[PDB]
């Protein structure tokens, strides 16, 4: 997942959070990728598409 964070520190702050696509596919962020900074690895209920947007509902 590309750009909801600006740094791996930010993703480290937000690890384990539950996200979802706009299709309601639930998911969880797992680990920040190393070289592209705000990019991370998430796991979903099944295969999401390239035309989706993930969402971290915070308050």
Partner 1 sequence: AKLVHDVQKKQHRERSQLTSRSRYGFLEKHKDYVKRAQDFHRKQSTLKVLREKAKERNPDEYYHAMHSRKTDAKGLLISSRHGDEEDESLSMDQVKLLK
- Under 8 Å between Cβ of 53 and 22: yes
- Based on the shown chain and the rule CB under 8 A, indicate whether residue 42 belongs to the binding site for partner 1: no
The one among 9, 12, 22, 33 contacting partner 1 by CB under 8 A = 22
3 binds partner 1 (CB under 8 A): no
CB contact set of 33 (below 8 Å; sequence gap of 6+): 8, 39, 40, 41
- Residue choice 16, 51, 57, 59 for contact with partner 1 (CB under 8 A): 51
Residue 22 DSSP symbol: T
Where does this chain bind partner 1 (CB under 8 A)? 22-25, 46, 49-53
């Amino acid at each position: 997942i590309k750009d909801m964070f600006s740094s791996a520190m930010e993703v480290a702050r937000f690890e384990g959070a539950q996200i979802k696509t706009v299709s309601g596919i639930r998911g969880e962020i797992k680990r920040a990728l190393s070289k592209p900074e705000g990019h991370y690895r998430a796991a979903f209920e099944d295969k999401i598409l390239m035309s989706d947007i993930v969402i971290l509902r915070s308050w």
